[PDB]
Design a protein around this nucleic acid. Sequence first.
RNA 1: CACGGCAC
Length: 162
Amino acid sequence: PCDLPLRLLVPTQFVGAIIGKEGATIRNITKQTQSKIDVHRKENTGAAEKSITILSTPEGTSAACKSILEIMHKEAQDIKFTEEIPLKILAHNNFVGRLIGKEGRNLKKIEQDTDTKITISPLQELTLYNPERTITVKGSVETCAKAEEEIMKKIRESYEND
RNA sequence: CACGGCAC
């Protein structure tokens, strides 16, 4: 019963749609996926993005992630946001060696198995008090969701072993 | 900001 959450970085402008008027959208998500979801109310001063923490079973976590991806994609269409919205996962640096693997073998396997392109933020962009690397996943809603499942499997495995 | 909230 691993208790490491999934942490996402989403554009600030899509949070209103994720939560929904009176909280109705996120309330439905957390009910349906049996998840605890915490949306940061203050932007990271890094960029125009807010972090979302999702605590659930691996399956409930993946379902909540996909729901958020679906909501974001629909809002972008609705406001004619033309740019791509990659999935961004934050992961503590202590887990990223295993996600990448020797010679990048593990990350390349996830890219092939899910048809995505995954890039991880550079090690020297960390700060002493922000140890979280940004995992950027470019793909469709469907492939990004599959990538999240595989990515978090390796993160949890690192979490329980490294 | 569509702004919700499951404690120890």
